[PDB]
From a paper:
Copper nitrite reductase (CuNiR) is part of the microbial respiratory N-oxide reduction denitrification pathway and catalyses the reduction of nitrite to form nitric oxide, a process with key agronomic and environmental impacts. CuNiRs are homotrimers, where each monomer contains a type 1 Cu centre (T1Cu) with a role in electron transfer and a catalytic type 2 copper centre (T2Cu) where nitrite binds and is converted to nitric oxide. The T2Cu centre has Cu(His)3–H2O ligation and nitrite binding displaces the H2O ligand. Rapid, shutterless X-ray detector technology on a synchrotron MX beamline was exploited to perform low-dose serial crystallography on a single copper nitrite reductase crystal, which survived long enough for 45 consecutive 100 K X-ray structures to be collected at 1.07–1.62 Å resolution, all sampled from the same crystal volume. This serial crystallography approach revealed the gradual conversion of the substrate bound at the catalytic type 2 Cu centre from nitrite to nitric oxide, following reduction of the type 1 Cu electron-transfer centre by X-ray-generated solvated electrons.
By ds4 (2.76 [name] accumulated dose) the nitrite had stabilized into a single ‘side-on’ conformation as observed previously in wild-type AcNiR structures. By ds4, the nitrite population converges into the ‘side-on’ NO2 conformation similar to that observed in previous studies, where it remains for a further six data sets. The conformation of Asp98 favours the proximal position at ∼0.6 occupancy between ds4 and ds10.
Author numbering:
A (entry chain A), B (entry chain A), C (entry chain A): 8 to 339
Amino acid sequence: DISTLPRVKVDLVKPPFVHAHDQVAKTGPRVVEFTMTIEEKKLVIDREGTEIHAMTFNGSVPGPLMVVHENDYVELRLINPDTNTLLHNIDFHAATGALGGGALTQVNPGEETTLRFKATKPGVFVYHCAPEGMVPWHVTSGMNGAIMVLPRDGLKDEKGQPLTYDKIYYVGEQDFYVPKDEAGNYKKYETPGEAYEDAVKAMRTLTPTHIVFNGAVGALTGDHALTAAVGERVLVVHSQANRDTRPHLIGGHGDYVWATGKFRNPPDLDQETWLIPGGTAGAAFYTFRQPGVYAYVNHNLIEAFELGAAGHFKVTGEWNDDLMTSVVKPAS
Amino acid sequence: DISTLPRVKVDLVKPPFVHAHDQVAKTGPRVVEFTMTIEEKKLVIDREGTEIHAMTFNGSVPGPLMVVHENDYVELRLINPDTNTLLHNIDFHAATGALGGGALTQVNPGEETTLRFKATKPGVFVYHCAPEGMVPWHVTSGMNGAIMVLPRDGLKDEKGQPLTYDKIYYVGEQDFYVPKDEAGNYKKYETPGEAYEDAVKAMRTLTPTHIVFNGAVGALTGDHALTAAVGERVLVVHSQANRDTRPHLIGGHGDYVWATGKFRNPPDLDQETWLIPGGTAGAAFYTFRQPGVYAYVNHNLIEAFELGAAGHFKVTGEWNDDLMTSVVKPAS
Amino acid sequence: DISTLPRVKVDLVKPPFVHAHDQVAKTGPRVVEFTMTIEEKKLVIDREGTEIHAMTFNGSVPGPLMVVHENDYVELRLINPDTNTLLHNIDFHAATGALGGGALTQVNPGEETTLRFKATKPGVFVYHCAPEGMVPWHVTSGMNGAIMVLPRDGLKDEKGQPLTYDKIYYVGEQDFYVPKDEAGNYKKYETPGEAYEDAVKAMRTLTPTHIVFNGAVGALTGDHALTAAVGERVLVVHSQANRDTRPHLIGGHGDYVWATGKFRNPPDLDQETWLIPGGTAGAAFYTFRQPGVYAYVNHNLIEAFELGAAGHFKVTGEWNDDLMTSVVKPAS
Ligand SMILES: O=N[O-]
Ligand SMILES: O=N[O-]
Ligand SMILES: O=N[O-]
Ligand SMILES: O=N[O-]
Ligand SMILES: O=N[O-]
Ligand SMILES: O=N[O-]
Ligand SMILES: O=N[O-]
Ligand SMILES: O=N[O-]
Ligand SMILES: O=N[O-]
Ligand SMILES: O=N[O-]
Ligand SMILES: O=N[O-]
Ligand SMILES: O=N[O-]
Ligand SMILES: O=N[O-]
Ligand SMILES: O=N[O-]
Ligand SMILES: O=N[O-]
Ligand SMILES: [Cu+2]
Ligand SMILES: [Cu+2]
Ligand SMILES: [Cu+2]
Ligand SMILES: [Cu+2]
Ligand SMILES: [Cu+2]
Ligand SMILES: [Cu+2]
């Protein structure tokens, strides 16, 4: 009887940060209550000032990472304020039935709904908006995030031993398809209905104009670089709701990787790069061994360095000359 | 001595259906006899009426699924009637030697041939036409299918326990490259030789115009939706002879997935989405838990909803409110 | 104390050949000394005579395969002669820290440097140039190769039994983005600085003009076909520093495949085709069972047969009619 279970209210945080949770479940199964408010908003996505009309869960691209344990119930109150213009819904790849929830969560502006589903499978999973007939437009406008369903006894390695992270980050990777005129400059639009056909045309090229982490070129750099210390164990959850990606930590590895995100499977060890298929979340665990700057990229390096799919870690601590050293510095 | 083995003649069926077979082999090794007749034919592939000249095995895109057991012999009589115009052959990725058979099966119009090969490796595998110098043109004109080589003791899970499907479907995914003029409309051609250079030009864009299941937009919908009941175990074989895909059951999962199709490997568990590389067949096993409509898609959602890579399941049975429910239906 | 370890100097060979090494380590850990000299040079990459300005390690595309054992130290002397024009460096995906070495190895023309790193993880790994702000340009100009870090006790199968190759080949796959004018012909450039913006424009299409093995269309064919004999065990290392590929041996299989290249993981068995993500090296082991010509391809068959991603094996020995035979040769 679900009414007999504890309820716990989660207050979400903005990516790449993740709301507080316990890796090993400290309670029995619970109804975990989340609220998200849809926000349609202008977002500047590149250094040139390109501005799009983003469609967001909770004001961010990606939407926030939700975290529960296997066999918890996820109860989401989804709010579509009357300041928005479009119909929206939500599909959880973690859920079973009704198109992941999408068939049950269609909200016009000025409406809300509450969905509950049982998180029966452990893993990281995409969630995204999916209104009938408009699905890729909403997803590729930024309306996607992820949910992590932890095993009740936390993560395990390929031998069944515990893997415990000290820090977790959520990197959402977004492909945008900003319409171009025949000279190649972006077009802008006066209403969503006036934008729709050229959004479809742009999408049908299958060639993103921008591929970004955390909603914009450079978002995970500078004062917003990811951080760690030598010796810290970091889990990086990475999602891509629409297109394949191939994450890579420049100067590091994925020590344990669930490339397709599902924790009942043993992780892949020692990865340089891994393929997260479009429509999937994956997760990589790494223990930092060296300080300094790292780049975390999609290793289509054009996508990373020309289109935006690159962020940084800043790692503090002691340099290990046994692992790497300059024997003779560059010289004539 | 192969002449001492039983022969069994298989009568193939049109995809997405699969000819009758036994999961666990009820006999010793056999020579399994198949016949396919090549048919070049016009096919309408979209709702707009776009018509291409398809190149088919047995009149369908994809060609039919062949099913044998490991260490059976596959004996294929391949017929190229004189009503066709082109040379064709067949390459089985299940086979060993002679370019998968292609070097031994070149048939002009008005010819036939018979190939035998031993199915030494269990899995689902692509087969496709591959005439020297014209390979991607034939494949991307629809001339590809798949063969399933079952282990003699049927499928097994990651722990070695049996996995028995109640139903099986074969979804062939086809990328088409319909030539476009500089305004973007499709061109049509008067002979295959007159079409060849612009087919090559279209292919070299690496951007399909259409990506379809079972040969056309919407083919696996309406009266031709896939079906199941709550509690039924379904295997979905999915092939893509030329380009990567990322299948996903919207509202469901791949409970056990051989993404790259080879049954000696343990399946991946609990997948949301999986990557089937171009040139591969994969297979996903799912037990339905909820009734209703599901969409089965390539989860590049542009490819699914704009280019055609989407089909439906219609599932009968009882709704489980424990797994999912609307707590508060959409309202003001 | 690294100074107490043996040093061994390796003399590299041109791909697809691989310098001599032992699979099972015959010594304790060593400092393995390599030297590479960067060469910027013109290369003709197709049958039409298209000529690009390639950026190479050691004069080849790909750069040579380096081979060490786990927990050896790799000490690379990297030389940038004054006959080159550009700044270069090197990033090893096998290494830990300093962007894989790139932060420590920036060499102007007329400079050299020596980097040492400990090869702590077994696998095949990409290495590539990565100068800040110019990364995809150098990589997609050919400036990438691979390193194999063997387990000290050699390769093992999924059950922990030895896998010993008789021959090894290194296939580097290169995506080139030759700039096109609005009629579609390639452009040529008078200096690297004058080429840079249109190189970036070409790359941003995400559509390679050429995808080649060993630096050119047809490079691994004819007198330069790969060779083997029936019964020989062959390891094919395959890298792609920037874009996904899907290798396939036409007429064969990958009997044991590390698609993402890391030997602590069990190999995938019986693969037809496998996905090597951009930014990764993979390795496939096969025992030949039939003589004749094989094609080794990227199984996007457009990429293989139209853009260049195809090579050949020529295999000597006895034909096995049990595995495959023509029962009735093509006839009227
Ligand atoms: O708790 N049964 O899904
Ligand atoms: O968190 N200690 O494994
Ligand atoms: O190529 N990714 O959908
Ligand atoms: O080494 N990563 O580009
Ligand atoms: O979902 N396996 O990582
Ligand atoms: O039955 N030997 O392949
Ligand atoms: O088919 N019964 O497992
Ligand atoms: O991107 N698939 O070949
Ligand atoms: O949830 N599938 O788009
Ligand atoms: O081929 N492994 O699914
Ligand atoms: O040998 N420690 O990396
Ligand atoms: O090299 N003999 O296994
Ligand atoms: O589609 N490969 O990057
Ligand atoms: O069978 N390979 O194209
Ligand atoms: O890296 N696993 O092949
Ligand atoms: Cu929406
Ligand atoms: Cu989805
Ligand atoms: Cu054909
Ligand atoms: Cu093939
Ligand atoms: Cu360089
Ligand atoms: Cu790299």
